[PDB]
Amino acid sequence: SRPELGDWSSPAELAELQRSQLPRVLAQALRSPFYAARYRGTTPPRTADDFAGVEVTAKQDLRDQYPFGMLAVGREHLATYHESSGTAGEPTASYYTEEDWTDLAERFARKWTGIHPSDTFLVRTPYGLVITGHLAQAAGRLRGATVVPGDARSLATPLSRMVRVLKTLDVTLTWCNPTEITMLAAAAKAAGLRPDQDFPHLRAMFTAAEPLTEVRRRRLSEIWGGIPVVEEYGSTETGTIAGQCPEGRMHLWADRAIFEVYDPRTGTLSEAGRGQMVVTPLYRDAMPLLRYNLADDVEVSTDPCGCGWLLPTVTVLGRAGTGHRIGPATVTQQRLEELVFSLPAAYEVMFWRAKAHPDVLELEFEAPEPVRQRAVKELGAALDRELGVPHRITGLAPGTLVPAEALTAQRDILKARYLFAEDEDWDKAVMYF
Amino acid sequence: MSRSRPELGDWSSPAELAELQRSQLPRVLAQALRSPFYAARYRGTTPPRTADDFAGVEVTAKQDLRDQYPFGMLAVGREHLATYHESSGTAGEPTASYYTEEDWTDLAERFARKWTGIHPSDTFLVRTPYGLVITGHLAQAAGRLRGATVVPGDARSLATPLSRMVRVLKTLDVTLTWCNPTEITMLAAAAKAAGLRPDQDFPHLRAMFTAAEPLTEVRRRRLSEIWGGIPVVEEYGSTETGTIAGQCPEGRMHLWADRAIFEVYDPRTGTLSEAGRGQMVVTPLYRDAMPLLRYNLADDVEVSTDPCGCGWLLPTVTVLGRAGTGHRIGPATVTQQRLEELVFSLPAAYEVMFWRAKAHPDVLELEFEAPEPVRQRAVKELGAALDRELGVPHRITGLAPGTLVPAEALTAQRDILKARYLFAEDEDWDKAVMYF
Ligand SMILES: Nc1ncnc2c1ncn2[C@@H]1O[C@H](COP(=O)(O)O)[C@@H](O)[C@H]1O
Ligand SMILES: Nc1ncnc2c1ncn2[C@@H]1O[C@H](COP(=O)(O)O)[C@@H](O)[C@H]1O
Ligand SMILES: Nc1c(O)cccc1C(=O)O
Ligand SMILES: Nc1c(O)cccc1C(=O)O
Ligand SMILES: Nc1c(O)cccc1C(=O)O
Ligand SMILES: Nc1c(O)cccc1C(=O)O
Ligand SMILES: [Mg+2]
Ligand SMILES: [Mg+2]
Ligand SMILES: [Mg+2]
Ligand SMILES: [Zn+2]
Ligand SMILES: [Zn+2]
């Protein structure tokens, strides 16, 4: 019913797998109050050729239509409801039928390392309204992997507990953002476990949600013993839209969506190049999207890649591509990250932050005491040689940017209690979290 | 014809129920021996295989589940597990439980035994944790079994503060909630703080499912009244057992005895019986991954086989738990359950929801929040109730709202941020790496 990797042998065959779905997709879209309103008074697009004419759908549209302005089915058919991360003030609602969920789960499950019944899969992203935890769990169950629901941002599951679970359950796969990969490495050391040796069953780490350079991705692999760090690109509104190949580039899942690159200035859409990621999902019923602009800054290739899936590649600059002018130079987060994570691994520089002033780059990072002044000097020389920005670099003690208590605090999972003995803490009566 | 597990109405007498149970025990006892824990227990001797042998079977204690952490109780290949969970309470001494896909169908069916129904027309806010504990996953699996739209509210997540849950309750026309009874009061207080009346401004809310705390009928009825007189539907369960009892329309919880053998353990005499007062013992009948033979939850319960007005033909259960622990204060014994009945007997217009007490050898110290006009009435009436019902000496203090339950818990909104490393000059770079 839905295409599989290897169902097309050329870009022309891929294009027809897409084109054949557009009548159903355009018919389903018009069922939603948003698109019915958009094409009121005129004749709607109904054929594949008409799709070239279709107007972009912006984030602002999804926000204006809160909660169910984008809904194309009866609510009786919805399986789950979700809201996006970012501004709580302007919620972005997304919702999925059971059949919508099978497409979502299949796309996440396209992990070049596999997800198997022999896997124990720690899901360490949030389950609170956002889709990310539910998505990894649904893929885990689709493939028969034992799912350990770690959740994230939950008082029930601090880092100390996740490290104990990683070790004691022989976890084989993780799902968490790239910062959480470093947070778990720092929490592992604090629990007396070496990330590079003491987790012999950990075979791959799945990651997304942040702009991630190859330089940082490779260091995260090295920190955890040289195991694969497998990136994907997605959103609450779209699910997974690209996944890594064994060579380390992300390929667009174009059999399940039409991908286009939007120039915001000219307002023109092309199938490759530099611009804003536009997505038309092909296998949705509940929340149809026509050329939804994620507004992520991306470069799409279509270059023949060494893996040979016959899919375009994508690099996600995102916000990390926003140039800040500092004296004569433009610095991006992506370029700073490459310099920070080019420091030797033995310096253990993982946690850092920078502020762009009009005149100077202020940058702080944690490094153990013996190596700190080497690290400050080498990062300074790297910035001089690569950017020529003025900089004030400060090395900090570990425990300064990422406090020791975040790495080691354990928290009992209490329920409300009302009657206490004299020697008990009655501060946990009603505020027990 | 073609469901493999029993449903309400498949037995017409206690004798028929008993045979539905006994017929599963050879499979259950064979599966139990496959686990390292039971194979070790019955090493060197003859293991139990038949129904008659079950009378002989030794209790499995919580301390056994802790000693066996993580997979000493595992009876199948790890390839067959769907999910892994750990219990609430002490993080220092974890209890693991785990379930195959088929184990999950039994769990989901038991939660779904809600006398109010769960239908495709329902929008179901799941407001218990998804972090290792089973509760969020269990409500979500039942929601999907019955076709209800599941809103994963999670609980104890920085992503879902009460202000956001109130907005969701209202704007999505939520029909069903699942959360502990304290969370029901927290949501009511957050609604008021947002300028919404729980008793009128949520017209689509038709029932509230609850568990996890000892809950008196007096408190349960007040929680119903606060939210407009809608049903508050209780169940009783544990991470290791799933749902073991659920409420009937008359307001008592019935044991799901078609899916487990329930026994009451007297710790003093060390005897197991099918009814009475003591510690809840459970033998689940429809699980493969983590077989349990007479697992003692150690919850303090009263099981009655007395007929209820509902007519389901299952024994009822009351869960005293910790709230049944007598603290002696001179000649009087005070229980949480009895204090709760007095606090929630105060008139609803006084708005007393949040309280706490400490047992001193000489005096009961009790504090609660009440609006200013009514506070002195509340202090006096609760004092007279304690004098009349317990005769304990008491120091009762009424507190300003925002004192036990801060305003920021009820109204604070929190952006769901991702890590950022490079900031413009005017931004807060404190959310770089600690972005929670
Ligand atoms: N691999 C990735 N690299 C960079 N940014 C990503 C990646 N995956 C997700 N994102 C970002 O996360 C957003 C998803 O937002 P949300 O739907 O709120 O979870 C995307 O639109 C991107 O801005
Ligand atoms: N309806 C209920 N009434 C009283 N206590 C309950 C109820 N439901 C659950 N519990 C308690 O919560 C425990 C479950 O603990 P856990 O497995 O850690 O979630 C039970 O063993 C009881 O102590
Ligand atoms: N994927 C995520 C999201 O959507 C929101 C917050 C956190 C994450 C993550 O990967 O941890
Ligand atoms: N990165 C994501 C993904 O791959 C799937 C779904 C959501 C996200 C996200 O960034 O939140
Ligand atoms: N059900 C719960 C649990 O098992 C642990 C902690 C909290 C709850 C709850 O109902 O909120
Ligand atoms: N309270 C619970 C329930 O009702 C079902 C399953 C588990 C629990 C729990 O408290 O762990
Ligand atoms: Mg529905
Ligand atoms: Mg498995
Ligand atoms: Mg328990
Ligand atoms: Zn490739
Ligand atoms: Zn009854």
Numbering used by the authors:
A (entry chain A): 4 to 436
B (entry chain B): 1 to 436
What do the authors of the reporting publication say about this deposited model?
We reconstituted the biosynthesis of the benzoxazole moiety found in nataxazole by adding two enzymes (NatL2, NatAM), to 3‐HAA, ATP, and Mg2+. We have determined the structures of both NatL2 (homologue of BomJ) and NatAM (homologue of BomN) from the antitumor nataxazole pathway. We show NatL2 catalyzes ester not, as previously reported, amide formation; the amide is a shunt product. NatAM catalyzes benzoxazole from this ester by a mechanism that we propose involves shuttling of protons to control the fate of a hemiorthoamide intermediate.
We soaked NatL2‐AMP crystals with 3‐HAA and obtained electron density for 3‐HAA and AMP. 3‐HAA (denoted as 3‐HAA1) binds almost identically to the molecule in the AMPPNP:3‐HAA complex. There is residual electron density suggesting that we could fit a second molecule of 3‐HAA (3‐HAA2) bound adjacent to the 3‐HAA1 molecule; the orientation suggested that the hydroxyl not the amine would attack the 3‐HAA1‐adenylate. We reasoned the low quality of the residual density arose from the crowding of carboxylate of 3‐HAA1, hydroxyl of 3‐HAA2 and the α‐phosphate of AMP.
